[PDB]
């Protein structure tokens, strides 16, 4: 599956690709303003996420710090990045479909836009300015908007039990974008695309 990952942001940014144990194609890549960089997602990749990564510093080696979304200090990715991390999240070719969602359950960063570039299904985004707006005890000194799982480790806001609600916290995230996870238990906003479809995530979609 080809993923075209594309900054609309007028900053750069580090996008990263990963599904947890391991990068998907390079992992990572330092996509300047406008700059579009297209990977390939291996056939039937589950729990694969694509971010982006802000003030980053690497040397000649690949080795450094992001403020939002480091993965263990590499510029290719193997790991999911540090909170916030606004998240486009994918499952590929499970039983025929595609399953694709933008999450909020990790902070937000960047906006984004993860759509489809093949018919049969429709785009999600979440495009609203969840940095500006954060609530003061989830905003991220280190830049972004961290979801309350990350900031206060309770059982209800990292939904431990697998018995948790919504919170003041997950609405404010839910209330800004409808169409991304709020929190673990949140009432999904995936979309089934066709199995083998190809996307695009947009990293600013708006501005």
Same mark, same amino acid.
């Given at each position: 599956?080809?993923?075209? +990952?594309?900054?609309?942001?007028?900053?750069?940014?580090?996008?990263?690709?990963?599904?947890?144990?391991?990068?998907?194609?390079?992992?990572?890549?330092?996509?300047?303003?406008?700059?579009?960089?297209?990977?390939?997602?291996?056939?039937?990749?589950?729990?694969?996420?694509?971010?982006?990564?802000?003030?980053?510093?690497?040397?000649?080696?690949?080795?450094?710090?992001?403020?939002?979304?480091?993965?263990?200090?590499?510029?290719?990715?193997?790991?999911?990045?540090?909170?916030?991390?606004?998240?486009?999240?994918?499952?590929?070719?499970?039983?025929?479909?595609?399953?694709?969602?933008?999450?909020?359950?990790?902070?937000?960063?960047?906006?984004?836009?993860?759509?489809?570039?093949?018919?049969?299904?429709?785009?999600?985004?979440?495009?609203?300015? +969840?940095?500006?707006?954060?609530?003061?005890?989830?905003?991220?000194?280190?830049? %972004?908007?961290?979801?309350?799982?990350?900031?206060?480790?309770?059982?209800?806001?990292?939904?431990?039990? %697998?018995?948790?609600?919504?919170?003041?916290?997950?609405?404010?995230?839910?209330?800004?974008?409808?169409?991304?996870?709020?929190?673990?238990?949140?009432?999904?906003?995936?979309?089934?695309?066709?199995?083998?479809?190809?996307?695009?995530?947009?990293?600013?979609?708006?501005?």
């Amino acid at each position: 599956a080809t993923f075209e +990952i594309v900054n609309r942001c007028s900053y750069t940014v580090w996008a990263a690709a990963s599904k947890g144990d391991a990068a998907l194609d390079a992992g990572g890549r330092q996509l300047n303003s406008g700059e579009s960089w297209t990977i390939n997602v291996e056939p039937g990749t589950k729990g694969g996420k694509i971010w982006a990564r802000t003030d980053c510093y690497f040397d000649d080696s690949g080795s450094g710090i992001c403020k939002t979304g480091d993965c263990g200090g590499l510029l290719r990715c193997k790991r999911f990045g540090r909170p916030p991390t606004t998240l486009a999240e994918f499952s590929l070719n499970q039983y025929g479909k595609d399953y694709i969602d933008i999450s909020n359950i990790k902070g937000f960063n960047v906006p984004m836009d993860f759509s489809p570039t093949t018919r049969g299904c429709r785009g999600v985004r979440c495009a609203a300015d +969840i940095v500006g707006q954060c609530p003061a005890k989830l905003k991220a000194p280190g830049g %972004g908007c961290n979801d309350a799982c990350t900031v206060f480790q309770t059982s209800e806001y990292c939904c431990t039990t %697998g018995k948790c609600g919504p919170t003041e916290y997950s609405r404010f995230f839910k209330r800004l974008c409808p169409d991304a996870f709020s929190y673990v238990l949140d009432k999904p906003t995936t979309v089934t695309c066709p199995g083998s479809s190809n996307y695009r995530v947009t990293f600013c979609p708006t501005a």
